[model samples]
Target: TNHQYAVIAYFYGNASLQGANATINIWEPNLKNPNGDFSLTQIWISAGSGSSLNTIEAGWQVYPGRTGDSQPRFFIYWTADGYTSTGCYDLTCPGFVQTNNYYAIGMALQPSVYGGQQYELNESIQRDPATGNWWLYLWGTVVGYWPASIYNSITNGADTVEWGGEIYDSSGTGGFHTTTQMGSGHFPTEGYGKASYVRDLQVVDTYGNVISPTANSFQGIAPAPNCYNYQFQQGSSELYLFYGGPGCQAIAHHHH
Candidate 1:
């Protein structure tokens, strides 16, 4: 069993939130905390231009819902500035619109540049540049967007992009962290189905087209190696991260 908090890979470059996309598989794991969290995948952009402490992030999550809701449901999350007061607390807030079947069909996001309405996921966030609004999309369809006035940073452009799996266990019942399996609980080398993976990775450029990153240009990082792990596999036509592992086990105690 591993120590727990894990993030797969982060790409370094000057990428505008014009758009980003990825495909992630859905998996059910053992959740130990009523308040626990599992970040299926996400992308991170610079808070503004040079700031370090703040950021813009969007992704999917599995969280314990309000009291009485026991089963985990698919949820979308995004933060324009930081996670403090600028974004929704979880799936309970407004601005997001669910369009597709959560379990049958894959998820997507097509953010609106005007922030007109029902925004929506493993999707993309695009900044209009002219209007400075952020749009969300799902499966190539527009779900919604965040208005420019709501953001202080990231209004200029985004700097970083990241994707992968992460889980948090606050109850301490599942060892030091949650026992949720990251991606099929198998490594990238394990190959499809058996392992969890994010594919069709691409970032939206200034031109408004989704483009793939140069080969071997990604950096994989995991804070707790013992709790979780990941590997980067860059193919000629596809780029993706395969990661996962069992969570930490409760420590044993012996009385003398």
Candidate 2:
């Protein structure tokens, strides 16, 4: 943006339960490459402390594993500061990392002075604000200083969808990944998907932390209808997600 703005109200991720039921399909006609390279530029996640058996994480779901083998295939997910192995897994390779001048995924790159690593990715859960409304804030890292005057722009903004990922076979069962193209060619509507229904996705500076309740922990929900099913769809008109309780209470409700 031409003007400078400071975010006083920190953005937060929803602490409610989410599902693998469906994916958010965003349309970008300008996308030119169906087999291009991209990485998670930002993220916000909140999961229950007891939801995941220690390995369960709460963040944006990307190229996910689809197969059922020990390493199956089509497995993809990005967490800014996640505590996962940080190396290859399932059937695909690594998809995330934070380096000197690069925040890489499947493919890493060195950002220019204007474009360094990630630019602020916060993840937090819904909390009861003193005012009575539930609000959250997510934070992780940022590339530039305050004010959007000269934040950063990948390849000069000619590309809106610059960072994306895909899953590949490692030597065993494979599943649908970002590589799975659609009729349109560019990371088909079927190939490109996102998760924002369980909670509101947000962007934060590089020094904030995801919102956390006074006595609750974050939790991530595994999708239903089989994690490998590619029939899932994303829609801009309606929302499909799971309604979870604070600190990932019980199995709430799932929406379609």
Candidate 3:
């Protein structure tokens, strides 16, 4: 099909949003078909409604088709037409303008070990009040943006913010599914040191006020629970979500 997703959605409705941010744990999900499958975790800042929803997404992805390896790489995507005919991944197209950036989009990054050191990418989409451009931030540093001039609705702000994992599978195994991993290749119930997570969910309003989403406003959505799962929780000081899974119903033997 198109793509499977496991995300924690923050439905703000008609709230005026300037941007959204999150810290996503990095993972190098194993793909059965490296060249045809991809696994990614990103934050989506969206606005408007219907088929013309405007969006800005950023995070890390394990895609050999784009990078030639299974290494997790920084990535971004945008669409002013709900992915109908506009937008693209990273800087492949002519919309995402690069500025004050050293690390290029799609550059490989280290992955968090299953039971060892964990790595993460802090990403944010901040909309400029004066320029109206949606600036992309990496670890608090500016990394360019999707110019406000090209967007249809996000120029005012976003209403929906989502963060989590997504995977693309094209394995033609009859009666079976692809063995692609979504996050750490482990279920969300695995807890720390094993599961992949995203934390510090923050929203900046049009007036530049920081807003934290409530537990009631957060919804953990896992479409294909048999293949992927997600869990939402409020930490000691912030809210977060754990997600990912070793896709089920695949060929017998081997999960690596």
Candidate 4:
């Protein structure tokens, strides 16, 4: 069985570092209060450590996370602001991305050009199962104004939210990652100081039942200049449906 949870994905800026260090978190339904503010305790830390040329899904163990307890969790698997892939900083692997010319760190895990992955979590849980067996389904982030408020949505076509991932503003060297794509995990500004902005969180039940909020709920959020709307969705289990999908030679798929 699965428990449903209202997903709140975003990054918290930590001025303590060069650019900004971010933290991602989620809160499921709880009876203690109206919206369950369940903290992410039992986390899986990758055994990945030190500077090294790693491979796909390479890294470390999923240990207990005690670092960013008061921080929020992101859904985009990427880092920005001139940051590149460095196994040393984040033991928890992130996705492909380009430098935002601002400030940040980490290697990019492009689910489109490369191999795409799937991520999900239990929507609801009676209590902190502590088993660390729960999964995160909806992946996305709230918009952040940098060093301040976490944005939930924006009002405009410019604020376009795309599933999977892509390589629009190609910032990588290979140039092979020019296609857009969907993502699997949160775009953490952990070590770096850049803020990760996101929107559109998915809700699901223990049975893997998915539920998306209506447009009215989305319209409630006012859009801002340079505003972009990115959403998270559960695609075909066939796996071959998303980017890096089998049969299709193209690296990424455009929300078909």
Best by TM-score: 3
lDDT of 3 by residue, 1-256 (tens): 5477888888765747888889999888898887678899999888887678888889998888887888999988899898898999888899999997677888888889989999989887888888889898788888898998878887878888999998888675421366788889899889776999998788986578898887778777787888888887678788778898988764468666
Task: Show model 2 residue runs off by greater than 4 Å.
Answer: 1-23, 26-179, 182-256
lDDT of 4: 0.20
Consecutive 10-residue window with the lowest summed lDDT within model 2: 153-162
Per-candidate TM-scores read: 0.72, 0.19, 0.92, 0.20
Candidate 4 regions off by >4 Å?
1-89, 92-107, 111-201, 205-208, 219-223, 226-256
Off by over 4 Å in 3: 172-176, 251-256
Q: Please give, for residues 99-191, the per-residue lDDT of candidate 2 as tens digits.
A: 222322222122111112222123332222222121222233221111111112110111111011122222222221222211112211122
- lDDT at 75, model 3: 89
* Weakest ten-residue segment in model 4 by summed lDDT: 149-158
Residues 1-256 of candidate 4: C-alpha lDDT, one tens digit per residue? 0111112221212111111111122221111111211122111111112332111111111111322232223222212211244322233443322223232222221211112232232112111123212112212221211111111111000111112212112233221222211121222211111112222233232233433433333321112111111333233321111111001112555785
Error of 4 at 9 (Å): 9.0
Worst 10 residues of 3 by lDDT: 170-179
lDDT of each: 0.54, 0.21, 0.84, 0.20
Off by over 4 Å in 1: 1-5, 8-17, 35-39, 49-57, 66-72, 90-122, 173-178, 207-209, 251-256
User: What digit string (tens of lDDT, one per residue) describes model 1 on residues 164-200?
Assistant: 7776555654334455555554444565555566666
